[PDB]
Amino acid sequence: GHMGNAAAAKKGSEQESVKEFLAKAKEEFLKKWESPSQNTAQLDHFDRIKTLGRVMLVKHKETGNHYAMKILDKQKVVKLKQIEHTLNEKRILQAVNFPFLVKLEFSFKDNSNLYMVMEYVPGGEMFSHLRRIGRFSEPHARFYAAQIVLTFEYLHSLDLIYRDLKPENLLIDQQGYIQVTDFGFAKRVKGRTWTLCGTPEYLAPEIILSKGYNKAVDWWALGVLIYEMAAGYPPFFADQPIQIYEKIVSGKVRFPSHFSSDLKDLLRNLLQVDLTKRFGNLKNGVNDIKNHKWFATTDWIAIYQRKVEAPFIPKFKGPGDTSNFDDYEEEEIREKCGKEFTEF
């Protein structure tokens, strides 16, 4: 067969160890999910530095640690029908723990705003680097992809569907690894869900077609991400979203001539309209992806342990250096909506 005895035994043992890891991680998650942390800091603990609601670089006055502080005006969450999403995003962030998920270090609220203070990821969005460099080599793309695969394996084991994968949402840290941010569309659904949400270029066909769907939309989105990282542009685009959606549902995808056969095979199995054939959605689960030829060189445990030398380290001009982030405006920071946000 494909694997001799030694490789087969090694692979089987690795897949069993994943099961054991995920089981413990669900225990840890559910404890924090069921008893979330609240009110772990306050605004005057922080100097505001620069805008990055709003997200601001801030400096903790006593440790000098920098943070990205997401500031959300309560009354403005209400008018935009976002109470549950905001509550849920904070709840998810304070309960998860994974090396490639941004870390909520503090949260608190006051008469006007809700605050989420997470570790500052100084390297900027993958989006900027990808547009600047143009496209990533397949090894470079694969290093990032492996981190998303592991992160989705983690999230999906907690019955969390992420639903907004794109380079805009992937921050690069000082060691060159990814930090996933923005859980505003994530949802803890065991079965199916129906909400039309996400970013047009990344929507799975079953979302476009107004079907009930499941975590398989995240694996479709990984296919779009891998393609975009390796091509420099996404597999489906057009002037307007309605024309993008026609392409997505069409069941056709074209590849640059520099894509390897292995990569095209993987993408044809992720970008699979037929849910009964889509990798990540089959009997073998995530293992169809992890064991694919395109990931043959990936040491999954070394990725998880962050022992792999990253192919790219963003320029690190210092702590609190904001140069990998672009420049924005200048607003100031002023009880409203108290009942709505008790749980925050």
């Binding site: 805009e168 949400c197 970013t199 047009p200 270029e201 420099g232 685009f237 057009a238 074209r254 640059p256």
Partner: peptide, 18 residues
């Protein structure tokens, strides 16, 4: 070319969610 089509789409910048 496909790359040219991408530039012509006008969706090369940061993409908003629905």
């Amino acid at each position: 070319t496909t790359y040219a089509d991408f530039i012509a789409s006008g969706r090369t910048g940061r993409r908003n969610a629905i």
